Amino acid sequence: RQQVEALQGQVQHLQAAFSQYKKVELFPNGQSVGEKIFKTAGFVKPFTEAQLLCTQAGGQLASPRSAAENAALQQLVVAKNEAAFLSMTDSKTEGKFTYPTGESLVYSNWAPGEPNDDGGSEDCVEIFTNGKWNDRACGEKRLVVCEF
Amino acid sequence: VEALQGQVQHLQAAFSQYKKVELFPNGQSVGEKIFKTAGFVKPFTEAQLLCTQAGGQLASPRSAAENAALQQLVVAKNEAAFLSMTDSKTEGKFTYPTGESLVYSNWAPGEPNDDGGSEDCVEIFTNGKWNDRACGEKRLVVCEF
Amino acid sequence: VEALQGQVQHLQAAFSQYKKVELFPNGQSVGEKIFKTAGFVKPFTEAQLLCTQAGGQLASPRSAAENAALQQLVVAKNEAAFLSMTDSKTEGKFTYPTGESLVYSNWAPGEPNDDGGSEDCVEIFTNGKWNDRACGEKRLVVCEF
Numbered sequence: 001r002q003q004v005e006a007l008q009g010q011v012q013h014l015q016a017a018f019s020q021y022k023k024v025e026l027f028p029n030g031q032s033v034g035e036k037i038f039k040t041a042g043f044v045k046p047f048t049e050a051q052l053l054c055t056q057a058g059g060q061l062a063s064p065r066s067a068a069e070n071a072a073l074q075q076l077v078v079a080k081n082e083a084a085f086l087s088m089t090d091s092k093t094e095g096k097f098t099y100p101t102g103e104s105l106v107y108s109n110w111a112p113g114e115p116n117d118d119g120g121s122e123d124c125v126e127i128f129t130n131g132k133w134n135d136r137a138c139g140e141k142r143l144v145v146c147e148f
Numbered sequence: 149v150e151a152l153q154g155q156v157q158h159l160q161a162a163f164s165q166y167k168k169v170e171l172f173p174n175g176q177s178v179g180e181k182i183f184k185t186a187g188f189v190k191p192f193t194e195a196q197l198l199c200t201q202a203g204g205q206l207a208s209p210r211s212a213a214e215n216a217a218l219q220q221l222v223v224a225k226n227e228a229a230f231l232s233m234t235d236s237k238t239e240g241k242f243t244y245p246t247g248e249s250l251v252y253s254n255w256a257p258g259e260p261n262d263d264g265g266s267e268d269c270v271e272i273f274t275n276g277k278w279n280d281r282a283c284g285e286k287r288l289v290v291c292e293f
Numbered sequence: 294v295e296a297l298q299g300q301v302q303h304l305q306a307a308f309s310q311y312k313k314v315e316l317f318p319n320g321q322s323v324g325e326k327i328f329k330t331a332g333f334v335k336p337f338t339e340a341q342l343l344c345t346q347a348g349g350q351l352a353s354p355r356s357a358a359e360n361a362a363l364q365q366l367v368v369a370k371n372e373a374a375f376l377s378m379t380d381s382k383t384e385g386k387f388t389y390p391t392g393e394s395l396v397y398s399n400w401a402p403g404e405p406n407d408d409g410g411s412e413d414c415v416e417i418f419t420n421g422k423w424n425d426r427a428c429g430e431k432r433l434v435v436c437e438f
């Protein structure tokens with residue numbers, strides 16, 4: 001009993017302290033939505049380099065799977081005023097975009113007419129400050145945003 | 149109750165280390181309050197919204213101790229910062245976002261002076277002193293949690 | 294109570310996620326140590342003070358593994374960083390802030406050379422190698438916690 005009483009106080013302290021630090025941590029480069037957290041590195045990089053940074057950090061490139069997640073990601077894009085790369089590509093099969101796992105998209109917010117594989121060479125995806133998506137050359141540099 | 153005690157102990161140690169990492173170099177802990185700067189400047193309204201959306205509010209030092217902690221961030225970035233208080237409701241009366249009156253102040257000599265008949269916001273200098281300033285001006289964004 | 298048990302499990306999961314978020318992109322964990330860069334350069338004394346005030350100390354790689362982890366941050370920022378060690382007390386003998394002699398070193402060929410007759414601090418290059426450098430120079434600030 002005794003060991004349980006004081007233990008409750010310790011857990012309550014950790015919960016309160018943690019709740020506070022979550023807010024501190026996310027300000028101003030992160031966004032929490034559901035059980036997902038987006039965090040921007042604050043700089044731009046080509047797709048492959050951006051992908052590697054996220055994977056090595058224990059996460060992956062931003063992969064919005066719902067309107068709510070897309071809106072959260074859009075807030076970071078707007079704050080930095082820099083379009084960002086998403087994790088999805090159609091590098092394997094032209095015209096078919098997939099997540100790093102190979103799974104087909106469960107959500108998309110393409111701007112009208114997109115994806116258009118402009119110049120026959122756009123296999124990556126960027127999200128604009130207006131929240132819309134556009135396929136873009138993977139060699140271009142875009143804001144790095146990872147999800148955890 | 150045994151293995152659980154070991155987990156809680158580990159969490160306290162891990163959390164303490166993590167807190168130090170988080171606060172370096174843009175945060176300051178004082179009492180139960182934490183100040184954190186965004187590292188950039190914004191006009192008051194925008195700065196205020198950023199803090200509110202983050203689940204906090206603009207820096208609101210309520211004691212000499214809190215003011216000193218906030219001052220450290222201002223000195224580190226060498227950029228004066230906005231406080232949360234304004235006298236937008238009633239000229240000459242500065243209040244917190246809750247309407248409550250100030251329980252602490254550290255005005256520079258002669259301030260607040262509503263210069264130009266248009267200074268309803270407050271900035272804190274690198275010397276820790278306060279000055280009322282036009283809300284349209286851009287100052288370092290520092291929120292409290 | 295089974296209630297506390299469940300709460301702790303979830304706390305561990307939430308904490309683990311926030312730890313990964315915290316380290317991206319300015320931190321690196323290796324073993325029980327965490328390196329975190331301030332993102333800017335400063336002379337040694339100032340860098341040392343920033344780390345000590347934050348409850349840590351300047352980066353002090355004690356193994357090849359720790360050196361590699363630190364190297365990642367230096368490469369990512371593309372800026373050589375200061376280590377904690379100096380030979381200010383006894384020329385030629387580098388020590389940690391505590392006074393203890395080095396237990397690991399990764400000197401670049403020809404180093405340390407005390408070039409100019411006054412290089413008592415240490416910097417780590419993007420290639421991971423070390424070079425003794427004048428303490429007055431400005432290098433990337435990286436602390437360990």
Ligand SMILES: OC[C@H](O)[C@H]1O[C@H](O)C[C@@H](O)[C@@H]1O
Nearest residue numbers: 114116118122134135136137
């Ligand atoms: O990614 C490129 C983007 O799709 C653009 O392609 C073309 O140049 C037609 C434009 O209307 C469109 O916006």
Ligand SMILES: OC[C@H](O)[C@H]1O[C@H](O)C[C@@H](O)[C@@H]1O
Nearest residue numbers: 259261263267279280281282
């Ligand atoms: O915010 C403006 C600030 O109060 C300044 O107002 C006047 O121009 C008189 C100055 O001595 C004072 O420093």
Ligand SMILES: OC[C@H](O)[C@H]1O[C@H](O)C[C@@H](O)[C@@H]1O
Nearest residue numbers: 403404406408412424425426
């Ligand atoms: O810190 C100075 C540094 O050791 C340099 O000293 C000399 O000028 C020889 C160089 O090869 C070496 O890189």
Ligand SMILES: [Ca+2]
Nearest residue numbers: 090091094123
């Ligand atoms: Ca293709």
Ligand SMILES: [Ca+2]
Nearest residue numbers: 090117122123
């Ligand atoms: Ca394509």
Ligand SMILES: [Ca+2]
Nearest residue numbers: 116118134135
């Ligand atoms: Ca396109």
Ligand SMILES: [Ca+2]
Nearest residue numbers: 235236239268
């Ligand atoms: Ca007024």
Ligand SMILES: [Ca+2]
Nearest residue numbers: 235262267268
């Ligand atoms: Ca006024």
Ligand SMILES: [Ca+2]
Nearest residue numbers: 261263279280
């Ligand atoms: Ca004034």
Ligand SMILES: [Ca+2]
Nearest residue numbers: 384411412413
């Ligand atoms: Ca010497």
Ligand SMILES: [Ca+2]
Nearest residue numbers: 380407412413
């Ligand atoms: Ca020397």
Ligand SMILES: [Ca+2]
Nearest residue numbers: 406408424425
């Ligand atoms: Ca040298």
